[PDB]
């Protein structure tokens, strides 16, 4: 076909979309080495001093 099935826009945000998709379908708290699936977090005690 030589026709490209892929058609992207500078306007789209694939990376983020995937971030949000993951959260909706599972527990982002779990780690998965294969995809470097280890969410960015911070210590609650550091962000908010108690």
């Amino acid at each position: 076909s030589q026709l490209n099935a892929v058609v992207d826009l500078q306007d789209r945000n694939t990376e983020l979309s995937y971030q949000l998709l993951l959260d909706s379908i599972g527990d982002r708290t779990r780690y998965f080495s294969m995809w470097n699936q280890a969410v960015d977090s911070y210590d609650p005690d550091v962000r908010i001093i108690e």
Binding site: S1, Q2, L3, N4, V7
Partner: protein, 50 residues
Amino acid sequence: THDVTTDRSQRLTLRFIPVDREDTAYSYKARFTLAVGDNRVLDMASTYFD
């Protein structure tokens, strides 16, 4: 207004990378895969080695 130009997505200019290269003592060999997609025609006069 019709039957001249495409309405479809399509590049005017394509660039090809060498598939095989051979830098020798007194010469240089470059091999490409010149691909002419379906629904397209190419006028050789419009080609050149960059």
